Amino acid sequence: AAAAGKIGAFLRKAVAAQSYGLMFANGKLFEATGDALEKRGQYGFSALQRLDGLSRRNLAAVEARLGALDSAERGLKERIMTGAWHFRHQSNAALDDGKTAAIASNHLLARESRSSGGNTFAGDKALLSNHDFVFFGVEFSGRGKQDKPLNHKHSTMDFGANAYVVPDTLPACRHGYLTLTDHFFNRVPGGREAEHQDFVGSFPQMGAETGRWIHEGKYRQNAPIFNYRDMKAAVALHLIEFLRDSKDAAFKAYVFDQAMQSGQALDRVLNSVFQAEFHIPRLMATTDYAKHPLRPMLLKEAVDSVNLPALSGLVSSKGDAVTAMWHAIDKGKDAVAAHLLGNWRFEAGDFASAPPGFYHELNYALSEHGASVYILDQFLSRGWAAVNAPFEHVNSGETMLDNAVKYGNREMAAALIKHGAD
């Protein structure tokens, strides 16, 4: 009997519970608000019941506070609610794998299985503790994946240069909550710092009101979270709330000119009024997706987010190999260094000056706080750096062993005193 669904759909819940356990156990905001759970290592379905209740209350509150609507502002709740949604990812790494996309979260990418990459500004680990979620930007166009997305940037930052568009129909989106703004930066961008300035410049009065208007102001730094069932109604129910506080020609003549064309007249409206996000649990495994090249890569992004297939094409000559190696030195990317050394033969002549854009000499770059032991040892073995030579510009007088002792790297201090005299 093909009853493997009864275990797959249960283990998916089991996995998602452990990822809502972190967010509902840690986090300043949920403890302050009263929506926090305990630390128990292995959580249960309570981490799903709490999300369901939170979504129910966060939708019912705005529904009750909002008026009973009318014949005009209830059809919008069917043009929007019964639509087609697709999620964008935009990351610079190498994720296609030919015919299988697998995107993991920070808490899985760093759970003793350390694959190089990462993009997070300090602050997320304490306030929310949602660093176990594969974030996704939402697209309301509704058309097929194989057409290049009309959006290119999130709230302000263009994360990657390689769109990974997926359809809503995946079974992994069942337990993915949605929030109308960035969960930490709960701030709708103003009418001037928004993408597609042509549409927003067409409607002048809209920009004055689509600015920084926060949500769930009972504690300032909240943002409502809606589960899969309650994520499509709450977008229209908040569009209505914004519209019945607006006096503009867009309040009629475009928001009801989008009815017969739900593409660039619905997406350009919703992604300008809001900046939504989708938060899938630990991993997103799929066989159907769309890898759309939006923008050509850069050496900084190819080295930061380690992507050998892209790096081997970006690097064309030794004049770029030296730059790639300098990028790898000041980040600790051992794999990139190994690739470059295996595909190039260097010489100590070109490592005697920092290329324009770098702020440290070689002996200080190899010995700073974030430097890697593998690259240091390899450079010492090739003899491209003197183990006993003092710094001239920064910290003059000191030596590499002094840096290794200051910061406490025992594996580096031993490698220095062993490979030299000091």
Binding site: A4, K6, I7, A14, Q18, G44, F45, T100, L283, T286
Partner: protein, 58 residues
């Protein structure tokens, strides 16, 4: 609730219950991805995946 108990007909009688068979059955029969099933089995923790012991889970 009893369905969660009794779908595990291919039982190891309160034991690991053939973790390799669990790895390979989800691969062949419902068309998942290995990067997802190896995560599910990792979330199944250690050997001794009792059909009733594992799902004292509510």
């Amino acid at each position: 609730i009893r369905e969660a108990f009794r779908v595990f007909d291919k039982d190891g009688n309160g034991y690991i219950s053939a973790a390799e068979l669990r790895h390979v059955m989800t691969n062949l029969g419902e068309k998942l991805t290995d990067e997802e099933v190896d995560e599910m089995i990792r979330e199944a923790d250690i050997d001794g995946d009792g059909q009733v012991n594992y799902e004292e889970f509510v």
